[PDB]
Subunit: 362 residues, 2 copies
């Protein structure tokens, strides 16, 4: 007996095209998404070149329209030079992303005043997402309050962070957040196995106490999202390993395992991978779209999943219960039992759908 | 013709007793204060042992009562273990100090949740001061808002910081701040002369643009305070130089020079070294207390000032106009032309004066 789920949404993926296509591209990353039961993804802007101006966005849109196998929206990225310049293209993006901790030169903001400038100039009705760790979460919350608008905090990883967000919500502040599977299912205890290279991720893996705090505060978590951040094994195992884990193909099986163990309900899962992503990012429904999963199938995660070009996984050896059997996307079979059956280019930019525009006052 | 000023107050000094008395002690540091026209000081808690519990405060109070030549109040310091434990002694302190960036093990807070715990437990009517740089200013402002109370930000040093505080004040938030003389009168341009050891200070010296921003935003600055942070030349010039500059003896002459040049008025100076310190920290008046200064005397700052045991100064070679001629403290001549004339122990704990208790609801 299969369970039918709606089309799941991952609001935080790095698909590496343009500029890092040995790590992943739109075609491989969206194949990974479909195999993980994900029918819509929001792609981050830290590509090469990064998506920080209209021409880069235009290029990315065409690459995605030509390569994506599932539907998508593309983020713009905040830079030290582009505040006040994105107004005409802002509505065509998933939202604006601010990289407030480590990142490359082009996306680095050197002052909180630059954060404020973005919050002041980006259209008030459109999403803003921050990569913000530890005290940076409090700092960007302050900027959001000074500018009287909302903010979404990516990949909350620590007890410190989830409790701060909990306190902000208790004061009625408009903040939402997401948690990634590696911060629910891996911890410091796994660093021995992973090693210092493969184990490199930002936010870093937390303590057992951090992991337990995220589970205990599930009510505070609005979304799950993978932070799919593919890098090859050569890169992860080399002299200056980049941070990040691939995660599209493993996210749903890990979470289904947790549902089977009664750690959260099926509804808790669907709020966090479907309804809340829709409502926070104003993402449209997908007609005739659904995912069929088998909740009884027990398997062990292998050394690499079939589709991501990362060709490794930090969850290797974990036992899971739950697997994606079939995905239907807009009336076409997109995935069955290990085979992707829609071509590159089948996917569409949801921000171009009439129902995918974010409502605003005239 | 001498100008009579009221007794000036420095709300931010490190007097190093107990535990660092080769760098300074109460007797030498308060001699330096008097020579700088300062009749009341608030001493920071990062001594050895640090002032983080009632017994350490009791010791510090007696050392100060025995050694101080001017009047004083003593800060308590926040630790990872003392939130909720300081209620009985809190009112006897200048306030509570939080070290939110670099500091030693005992005063290190590892989580914003610990900041929140202090803001929640420290009596709401008593001062809280934070060492907070760059985004940490925004973060502690957020904590202050979540807990619905005020905060005072020490030594603002950057354009980024003063503009953030300016924005917070424009939203009506209860925040005050201070600036130290080295951030008004020194910059990156001086690092060549000072070298990497002597030049070490936290917050670090700013760019010319940082300095210009602080002057342009003088209206946002509530207090001046020295952050007198004495270390010996051997320490500053050695392999792991501690951050900090001595500043009690040079602060007023530097600022009087600026008054003479019309960079700020005498009133602007007295608001920031007398009236605002009084009102932010609820410090009592000092009867029959005043400072006589000569505004016409031109001199060059030497390689060390007479009183601080630091025995060096980063302002060496700067030309100033303005000098302290006489100080009278509670009806006794305390300083004349280079000679301190009150003994160690003349100074008193102002929090023990009836007028020095902070008013509170019953
Ligand atoms: Zn991130
Ligand atoms: Zn990311
Ligand atoms: Zn539903
Ligand atoms: Zn400080
Ligand atoms: Zn200090
Ligand atoms: Zn006055």
């Amino acid at each position: 007996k299969l369970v039918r789920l709606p089309g799941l949404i991952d609001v935080h993926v790095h698909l590496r095209e343009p500029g890092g296509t040995h790590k992943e591209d739109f075609a491989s990353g969206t194949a990974a998404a479909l195999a993980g039961g994900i029918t819509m993804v929001c792609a981050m802007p830290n590509t090469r070149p990064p998506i920080i101006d209209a021409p880069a966005l235009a290029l990315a849109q065409k690459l995605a329209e030509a390569g994506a196998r599932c539907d998508f929206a593309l983020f713009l990225g905040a830079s030290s030079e582009n505040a006040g310049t994105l107004g005409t293209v802002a509505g065509s993006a998933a939202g604006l992303k601010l990289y407030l901790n480590e990142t490359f030169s082009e996306l680095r903001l050197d002052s909180v005043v630059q954060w404020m400038e973005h919050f002041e100039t980006w259209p008030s009705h459109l999403p803003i997402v921050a990569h913000a760790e530890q005290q940076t979460v409090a700092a960007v919350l302050m900027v959001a309050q000074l500018t009287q608008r909302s903010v979404h905090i990516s990949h909350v990883a620590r007890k410190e962070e989830i409790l701060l967000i909990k306190a902000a919500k208790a004061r009625g502040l408009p903040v939402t957040c997401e948690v990634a599977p590696h911060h629910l299912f891996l911890s410091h205890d796994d660093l021995e196995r992973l090693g210092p290279g493969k184990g490199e991720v930002r936010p870093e893996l937390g303590s057992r106490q951090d992991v337990e705090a995220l589970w205990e505060n599930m009510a505070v978590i609005d979304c799950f999202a993978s932070d799919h951040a593919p890098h090859t094994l050569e890169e992860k195992c080399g002299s200056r390993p980049p941070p990040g884990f691939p995660g599209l193909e493993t996210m749903l099986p890990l979470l289904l395992t947790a549902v089977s163990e009664g750690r959260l309900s099926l509804d808790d899962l669907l709020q966090r991978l479907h309804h809340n992503p829709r409502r926070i990012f104003h993402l449209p429904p997908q007609e005739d779209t659904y995912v069929e999963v088998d909740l009884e199938h027990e398997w062990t995660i292998p050394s690499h999943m079939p589709f991501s070009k990362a060709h490794w996984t930090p969850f290797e050896g974990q036992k899971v219960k739950g697997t994606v059997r079939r995905v239907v996307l807009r009336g076409e079979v997109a995935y069955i039992d290990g085979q992707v059956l829609v071509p590159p280019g089948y996917g569409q930019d949801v921000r171009k759908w009439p129902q995918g525009a974010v409502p605003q006052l005239p």
